[PDB]
Write a structure and sequence with these properties.
Chains C, F: Belongs to the avidin/streptavidin family. The complex is a heterooctamer, with four copies of chain A and four copies of chain B (about 10 residues). Chain A is mainly beta. Helix content of chain A is about 5%, strand content about 60%. Chain A is globular and about 50 Å long. Classes of the chains: A mainly beta (about 120), B little secondary structure (about 10).
């Protein structure tokens, strides 16, 4: 449900995700790196599947962050795909892909994969 | 990288 | 080239992707599935990294599509991560993650992974 | 699923 | 180091992995599903990189299990890629790919991805 | 066909893979990298699922290669998961995971993912 | 599937 | 890395 998703979330590496879920399935916000001052904020956009999910099923969602802002340009973008699971302890469990822009020759090793779990802290 | 933890 | 990402792209499965790249990193458009159909269209939103790349590199980008529209709701979402390479033959090479909303017990197999190459042909 | 090919 | 890897390990879903690391970088053993009686054992084979790793770095390894034995045939195979991290609490952190045999048409959705962490219990 | 997996396979990067499929699910062989070279050969071990597949399905398999031989040690290992399809044009379509041994602080980016299609051509 | 938890 | 193309 949009409300449950909306809020501030953190993951085990110390990064910050601030998101607002709109009624039209949109996801917007900012993502901040693990500690490190104020200018570590990047724009994120995503989508969530507003489910009739009376199954205790999670809500599927995903979002993208291109690692470029006014202070830095890492020439890479990450996409997180996962599910939002509500309750008193809501969590968003994801798997992510981080692709860096490479030349033809290193394209083979341009993508990293991992997983992150986010815990909600504020609305 | 802005997606990993802090530095040393 | 920069906003060479804007346009209509097709992949090997037949799906079409229509996007507009904004000068500041935004990616907006529609993703349409099988048959072309009429409302096999879903909204997509993404971001791309606008950089100098003297060393002939591709442009990193990614986008998401939640599989729900006013006619279908597949309780899932796909995210594509990859890079744009322009030239005579522009292509967007991606790897994707498709996660379905499951219950705990099925969460271990909630995600499929694959790859797709999109062209303007 | 709307991500696959057609069901023809 | 072969010793540290050799032993019995379990992961959070309740599955059992029994492995022997040989001096030649080989990995052999059996994998058992999460609870479920005796005939839930499958053969696994893998390789580990015997590292001069005096960095507190993990040892990279991987293994494969084809889900077919004398009782069942699931027509699928899983490969786990990860690192062994020793200490009093040794762990093997992995990311896995599970591919099922499909026809040409469903090949697009033949592979699942996830992650599992194994805790060592016996030598 | 069943032990049609046995043979020499090549992928788009130039690497060669030579394997023997045992009647009971084993996969053994050598994987050689760039240039062909001499000791760009690494041992590979894997497993494949021997099944009836009336419905024209591929055969699921997977294998690992630890990147260490008596000449190099790249402190990493790759696992390929995929399926074999035989016929006039046999192919092994895979997705792979390459994990490097890192220290905790770098563990978040210890794994690369990709895909490779191997042919006997 | 022999890689998931027990059944219900 | 021995998994890539050659360094030619």
């Amino acid at each position: 449900a949009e409300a449950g998703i909306t809020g501030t979330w953190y993951n085990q590496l110390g990064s910050t995700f601030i998101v607002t879920a709109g009624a039209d399935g949109a996801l917007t916000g900012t993502y901040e790196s693990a500690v490190g001052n104020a200018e570590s904020r990047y724009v994120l956009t995503g989508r969530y599947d507003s489910a009739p999910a009376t199954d205790g099923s999670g809500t599927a969602l995903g979002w993208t962050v291109a690692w470029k802002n006014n202070y830095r340009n890492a020439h890479s973008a990450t996409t997180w795909s996962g599910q939002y699971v509500g309750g008193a302890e809501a969590r968003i469990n994801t798997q992510w892909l981080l692709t860096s822009g490479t030349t033809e020759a290193n394209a083979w090793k341009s993508t990293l994969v991992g997983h992150d779990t986010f815990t909600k802290v504020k609305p | 990288h802005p997606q990993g933890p802090p530095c040393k």
